[PDB]
Coordinates of all heavy atoms in Angstrom, one line a residue:
Chain U
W291 N 39.9 37.0 -53.1 CA 39.2 37.4 -54.3 C 40.1 37.4 -55.5 O 41.2 37.9 -55.6 CB 38.7 38.9 -54.1 CG 37.7 39.1 -53.1 CD1 37.4 38.4 -52.0 CD2 36.8 40.3 -52.9 NE1 36.4 39.0 -51.2 CE2 36.1 40.2 -51.8 CE3 36.7 41.5 -53.7 CZ2 35.1 41.1 -51.4 CZ3 35.7 42.4 -53.3 CH2 35.0 42.3 -52.1
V292 N 39.6 36.7 -56.5 CA 40.2 36.5 -57.8 C 39.3 37.3 -58.8 O 38.1 36.9 -59.0 CB 40.4 35.0 -58.2 CG1 41.0 34.9 -59.6 CG2 41.2 34.3 -57.2
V293 N 39.9 38.2 -59.5 CA 39.2 39.1 -60.5 C 39.5 38.6 -61.9 O 40.7 38.5 -62.3 CB 39.6 40.6 -60.4 CG1 38.8 41.4 -61.3 CG2 39.4 41.1 -58.9
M294 N 38.5 38.2 -62.7 CA 38.7 37.7 -64.0 C 37.8 38.6 -65.0 O 37.0 39.3 -64.6 CB 38.2 36.3 -64.2 CG 39.3 35.3 -63.6 SD 38.5 33.9 -62.8 CE 37.3 34.7 -61.7
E295 N 38.1 38.4 -66.3 CA 37.4 39.1 -67.3 C 36.0 38.5 -67.4 O 35.6 37.5 -66.9 CB 38.0 38.7 -68.7 CG 39.4 39.3 -68.9 CD 40.0 38.9 -70.2 OE1 39.8 37.8 -70.8 OE2 40.8 39.8 -70.8
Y296 N 35.1 39.3 -68.0 CA 33.7 39.0 -68.2 C 33.2 39.7 -69.4 O 33.9 40.7 -69.9 CB 32.8 39.4 -67.0 CG 31.6 38.5 -66.8 CD1 31.7 37.2 -66.5 CD2 30.3 39.0 -67.1 CE1 30.6 36.3 -66.3 CE2 29.2 38.2 -67.0 CZ 29.3 36.8 -66.6 OH 28.2 36.0 -66.5
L297 N 32.1 39.4 -70.0 CA 31.5 39.9 -71.2 C 30.0 40.2 -70.9 O 29.3 39.5 -70.1 CB 31.7 38.9 -72.4 CG 33.1 38.6 -72.8 CD1 33.1 37.4 -73.8 CD2 33.8 39.8 -73.4
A298 N 29.4 41.2 -71.6 CA 28.0 41.7 -71.5 C 27.0 41.1 -72.4 O 25.8 41.4 -72.3 CB 28.1 43.2 -71.7
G299 N 27.4 40.2 -73.4 CA 26.5 39.6 -74.3 C 25.7 38.4 -73.9 O 25.2 37.7 -74.8
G300 N 25.8 38.0 -72.6 CA 25.2 36.7 -72.1 C 25.9 35.5 -72.5 O 27.0 35.5 -73.0
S301 N 25.2 34.3 -72.2 CA 25.8 33.0 -72.5 C 25.2 32.5 -73.9 O 24.3 33.0 -74.4 CB 25.5 32.0 -71.4 OG 24.1 31.8 -71.3
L302 N 25.9 31.4 -74.4 CA 25.4 30.8 -75.6 C 24.0 30.1 -75.4 O 23.3 30.0 -76.4 CB 26.5 29.7 -76.0 CG 26.3 28.9 -77.3 CD1 26.1 29.9 -78.5 CD2 27.5 28.0 -77.5
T303 N 23.7 29.6 -74.2 CA 22.4 29.0 -73.9 C 21.2 29.9 -74.3 O 20.2 29.4 -74.8 CB 22.3 28.7 -72.4 OG1 23.5 28.1 -72.0 CG2 21.2 27.8 -72.0
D304 N 21.3 31.2 -74.0 CA 20.2 32.2 -74.3 C 20.1 32.3 -75.8 O 19.0 32.4 -76.3 CB 20.6 33.6 -73.7 CG 20.8 33.6 -72.2 OD1 20.1 32.9 -71.5 OD2 21.6 34.4 -71.7
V305 N 21.2 32.3 -76.5 CA 21.2 32.3 -78.0 C 20.6 31.1 -78.6 O 19.7 31.2 -79.4 CB 22.6 32.7 -78.5 CG1 22.8 32.2 -80.0 CG2 22.8 34.2 -78.4
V306 N 21.0 29.8 -78.1 CA 20.5 28.6 -78.6 C 19.0 28.3 -78.3 O 18.4 27.7 -79.1 CB 21.4 27.3 -78.4 CG1 22.9 27.6 -78.8 CG2 21.4 26.9 -76.9
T307 N 18.6 28.8 -77.2 CA 17.2 28.6 -76.8 C 16.2 29.6 -77.4 O 15.0 29.4 -77.4 CB 17.0 28.4 -75.3 OG1 17.5 29.5 -74.6 CG2 17.7 27.1 -74.8
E308 N 16.7 30.8 -77.8 CA 15.9 31.9 -78.3 C 16.1 32.2 -79.8 O 15.3 33.1 -80.3 CB 16.1 33.2 -77.5 CG 15.9 33.0 -76.0 CD 14.6 32.6 -75.5 OE1 13.6 32.8 -76.1 OE2 14.6 31.9 -74.4
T309 N 17.0 31.6 -80.5 CA 17.3 31.9 -82.0 C 17.6 30.7 -82.7 O 17.9 29.6 -82.1 CB 18.5 32.9 -82.1 OG1 19.7 32.1 -81.9 CG2 18.5 34.1 -81.2
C310 N 17.6 30.8 -84.1 CA 17.9 29.7 -85.0 C 19.3 30.1 -85.6 O 19.3 31.0 -86.4 CB 16.9 29.5 -86.1 SG 15.3 29.0 -85.5
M311 N 20.3 29.4 -85.2 CA 21.7 29.7 -85.6 C 21.9 29.0 -87.0 O 21.4 27.9 -87.2 CB 22.7 29.2 -84.6 CG 22.8 30.0 -83.4 SD 24.0 29.3 -82.2 CE 25.6 29.9 -83.0
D312 N 22.7 29.7 -87.9 CA 23.0 29.1 -89.1 C 24.4 28.4 -89.0 O 25.1 28.7 -88.0 CB 22.8 30.0 -90.4 CG 23.7 31.3 -90.4 OD1 24.9 31.2 -90.1 OD2 23.1 32.3 -90.8
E313 N 24.8 27.5 -89.9 CA 26.0 26.8 -89.9 C 27.3 27.7 -89.9 O 28.3 27.4 -89.2 CB 26.1 25.8 -91.1 CG 25.2 24.7 -90.9 CD 25.4 23.5 -91.8 OE1 26.5 23.4 -92.4 OE2 24.5 22.6 -91.9
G314 N 27.2 28.9 -90.5 CA 28.3 29.9 -90.5 C 28.5 30.5 -89.2 O 29.6 30.8 -88.8
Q315 N 27.4 30.6 -88.4 CA 27.5 31.1 -87.0 C 28.0 30.0 -86.0 O 28.8 30.3 -85.2 CB 26.1 31.6 -86.5 CG 25.7 32.9 -87.3 CD 24.3 33.3 -87.1 OE1 23.3 32.5 -87.3 NE2 24.1 34.6 -86.9
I316 N 27.5 28.7 -86.2 CA 27.9 27.6 -85.4 C 29.4 27.3 -85.6 O 30.1 27.1 -84.6 CB 27.0 26.3 -85.8 CG1 25.5 26.6 -85.4 CG2 27.6 25.1 -85.2 CD1 24.5 25.5 -85.8
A317 N 29.9 27.3 -86.9 CA 31.3 27.2 -87.2 C 32.2 28.2 -86.5 O 33.1 27.9 -85.9 CB 31.5 27.2 -88.7
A318 N 31.7 29.5 -86.6 CA 32.4 30.6 -85.8 C 32.5 30.3 -84.3 O 33.6 30.5 -83.8 CB 31.7 31.9 -86.1
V319 N 31.5 29.8 -83.6 CA 31.5 29.5 -82.3 C 32.4 28.3 -82.0 O 33.3 28.3 -81.1 CB 30.1 29.3 -81.6 CG1 30.2 28.8 -80.2 CG2 29.3 30.6 -81.7

Side-chain angles (χ1 to χ4, degrees):
Chain U
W291 293 18
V292 178
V293 187
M294 283 146 309
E295 295 179 323
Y296 209 72
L297 300 169
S301 66
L302 184 55
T303 315
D304 301 328
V305 157
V306 304
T307 58
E308 307 301 331
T309 76
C310 296
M311 288 179 74
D312 61 45
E313 290 194 14
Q315 293 169 310
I316 294 174
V319 175

